[PDB]
Amino acid sequence: ACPAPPPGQPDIRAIGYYTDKAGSVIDPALQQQNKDATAPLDRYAADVARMSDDYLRNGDPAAAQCTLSWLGAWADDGAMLGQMIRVNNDQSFYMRQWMLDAVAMAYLKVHDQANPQQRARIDPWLQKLARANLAYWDNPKRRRNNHYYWGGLGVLATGLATDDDALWQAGHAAFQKGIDDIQDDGSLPLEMARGQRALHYHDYALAPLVMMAELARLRGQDWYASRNHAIDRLARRVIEGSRDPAWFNQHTGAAQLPLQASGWVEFYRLRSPDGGVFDAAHARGPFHSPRLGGDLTLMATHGIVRTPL
């Protein structure tokens, strides 16, 4: 039987936990309170990631149905369409983007099992979420850093799963900003201002850029080639930094906390092996990341979905 989704909450109140201008020094107390406040969201995201992972792994329609039953409950309860409560920063909005990433990627993965009733419940819910998220980015005072790319992935997954061309194009626009932000040395100007977490935030930025490239690949478009394979410079900068932080330690003037590459390597190593520079990262899998779609090792190996369109 399918266990009970936790009640969907209209409101989000997350808590920002960096204390420096560079967004790099953590207040453990604020971080812990943010964890506690967001635990139910994070549980739900982990669970729809996992049940959609079970469906991709063996094609058991029961796993697909239970995923759809959880997504449907939240759609019915208007979860996350309430007030983004501002404590000290935009953490509630950032959390809505991350949560749309998880649920829209969960829905995509199980979409070929969605009956017309379920599609009619889930699609408008994801559409409202995506459009609310885009409305934030219409304000030219909002700095388009990695939050824009992470927002883009949820919008693009939503555009694909629900056949919304406007959301697809808005998805692509966020991908393009990331690609256009990559300098010749493979850095992102806004991620280079993050002190000891500059290397972390280069991997953080890359990972949704790769997942958006992979969704475009489903639709039969190559986005990887954009601006002369500019993404390859970021991917190279990040993996070289995973082995040797010296470049980041010089360019930022701050000792980098050490990076282990996140599960984008699962896709990127098939697209551009660059003489195997990602094999070390791969050996540390399988890679699980609810906000990127869940089991990135399985989706890399067998596909983000079990059947096309």
Amino acid type, 177: K
Q: Can you say how many angstroms the Cα of residue 270 is from the centroid of all Cα atoms in its chain?
A: 20
Are 113 and 61 spatial neighbours (Cβ–Cβ below 8 Å)? yes
Pick from 150, 106, 157: which is nearest to 127 by CA?
157
Experimental approach: X-ray
Q: Can you say how many angstroms the Cα of residue 293 is from the centroid of all Cα atoms in its chain?
A: 7
In a domain, 255, yes or no: yes
In a domain, 202, yes or no: yes
Query: How far apart, in Å, are the Cα atoms of 146 and each of 97, 152, 172, 247, 292?
Result: 11, 10, 14, 20, 13
Pick from 86, 113, 80: which is nearest to 6 by CA?
80
Distance, in Å, from the CA atom of 163 to the CA atom of 284, rounded to the nearest integer, reads 36
In a domain, 18, yes or no: no
Distance, in Å, from the CA atom of 104 to the CA atom of 59, rounded to the nearest integer, reads 19
In a domain, 257, yes or no: yes
In a domain, 11, yes or no: no
Distance, in Å, from the CA atom of 177 to the CA atom of 150, rounded to the nearest integer, reads 12
Domain that holds residue 257: 28-302
Distance, in Å, from the CA atom of 200 to the CA atom of 23, rounded to the nearest integer, reads 12
In a domain, 137, yes or no: yes
What's this structure's resolution in Å? 2.1
Query: 187: how many CB neighbours lie within 10 A of its CB?
Result: 22
Query: How far apart, in Å, are the Cα atoms of 165 and each of 155, 177, 245, 274?
Result: 11, 19, 41, 34
Distance, in Å, from the CA atom of 1 to the CA atom of 41, rounded to the nearest integer, reads 22
Amino acid type, 154: G
Domain containing residue 74: CATH number: 1.50.10.100
Q: Beta strands 288-289 and 294-295: pairing type?
A: antiparallel
Query: How far apart, in Å, are the Cα atoms of 265 and each of 42, 81, 199, 284?
Result: 23, 33, 15, 11
In a domain, 199, yes or no: yes
Residues recorded for the chain: 309
How many structural domains are present in the chain? 1
Pick from 151, 143, 205: which is nearest to 174 by CA?
151
HSE-CB for 281 with a 13 A CA cutoff:
27
SS3 for the chain, per residue?
CCCCCCCCCCCECCCCCECCCCCCCECHHHHHHHHHHHHHHHHHHHHHHHHHHHHHHHCCHHHHHHHHHHHHHHHHCCCCCCCECCCCCCHHHHHHHHHHHHHHHHHHHHHHHCCHHHHHHHHHHHHHHHHHHHHHHCCCCCCCCHHHHHHHHHHHHHHHHCCCHHHHHHHHHHHHHHHHHCCCCCCCCCCCCCHHHHHHHHHHHHHHHHHHHHHHHHCCCCCCCHHHHHHHHHHHHHHHHHHCCHHHHHHHCCCCCCCCCCCCHHHHHHHCCCCCCCHHHHCCCCCEEHHHCEEHHHHHHHCCCCCCC
In a domain, 17, yes or no: no
Instruction: Print burial letters for 273-298: b (CB count within 10 Å at least 16), e (below 16).
Output: eeeebbeebbeeeebbbbbbbbbbbb
